């Protein structure tokens, strides 16, 4: 379910930024992540929030559900 | 001189879940989420009743 909610959100934000182009010198730096950065480091860089702020994309809603699942895993294990 | 200088100048579905779990096990679980190395040995050195368990 997490990937189901993440992949469509990523494609939606990509469609949004491609529709609202507003071509500049930073749009290429923002959209090199789609063509370059193969999926390994792509997911590595789009999945990082243990400090208070990183370059996480606009799907902030799934961050909370991931934290909830991580807390559930921690309390299912022996970690208090 | 400026003119001379100017002349000189002119002259698909299931790969994503696998990669997700790989990234999760790579950078989400082993990030120092436990501290037991002292309580473990403290309860292991107690001879509640010979030889202690840690001594064994």
H/E topology pattern of chain A: HHHH
Helix vs. strand class of chain A: mainly alpha
The span between the termini of chain A is: 26 Å
Q: Count every beta strand of chain A, where a strand is a DSSP E run of 2 or more residues.
A: 0
Strand percentage of chain A:
under 5%
Helix residue percentage of chain A: 55-70%
> Assembly type of the shown chains?
part of a larger assembly
Main sheet summary of chain A: none
Question: Number of helix segments of chain A?
Answer: 4
Largest interface, counted by CB within 8 Å of the partner chain's CB: A-B, 14 and 14 residues
What value does the Rg of chain A take, in angstroms? 15 Å
Instruction: Sum up the overall morphology of chain A in one term.
Output: elongated
PDB class: membrane protein
Keywords: calcium, calcium channel, calcium transport, ion transport, ionic channel, metal transport, ER/SR membrane, ryanodine receptor, ryanodine, receptor, wild type, membrane protein
Entry title: Structure of recombinant RyR2 (EGTA dataset, class 2, closed state)
Chains A, B: Ryanodine receptor 2
């Amino acid at each position: 379910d997490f990937v189901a909610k993440l992949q469509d959100n990523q494609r939606f934000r990509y469609n949004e930024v491609m529709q609202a182009l507003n071509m500049s010198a930073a749009l290429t730096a923002r959209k090199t992540r789609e063509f370059r950065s193969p999926p390994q480091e792509q997911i590595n860089m789009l999945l990082n929030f243990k400090d208070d702020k990183s370059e996480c994309p606009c799907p902030e809603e799934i961050r909370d559900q991931l934290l909830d699942f991580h807390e559930d895993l921690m309390t299912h294990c022996g970690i208090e | 001189x400026x003119x001379x200088x100017x002349x000189x100048x002119x002259x698909p579905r299931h790969r994503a879940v696998n990669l997700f779990l790989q990234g999760y096990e790579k950078s989400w679980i082993e990030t120092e989420e436990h501290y037991f190395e002292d309580k473990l040995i403290e309860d292991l050195a107690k001879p509640g009743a010979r030889v202690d368990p840690l001594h064994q």
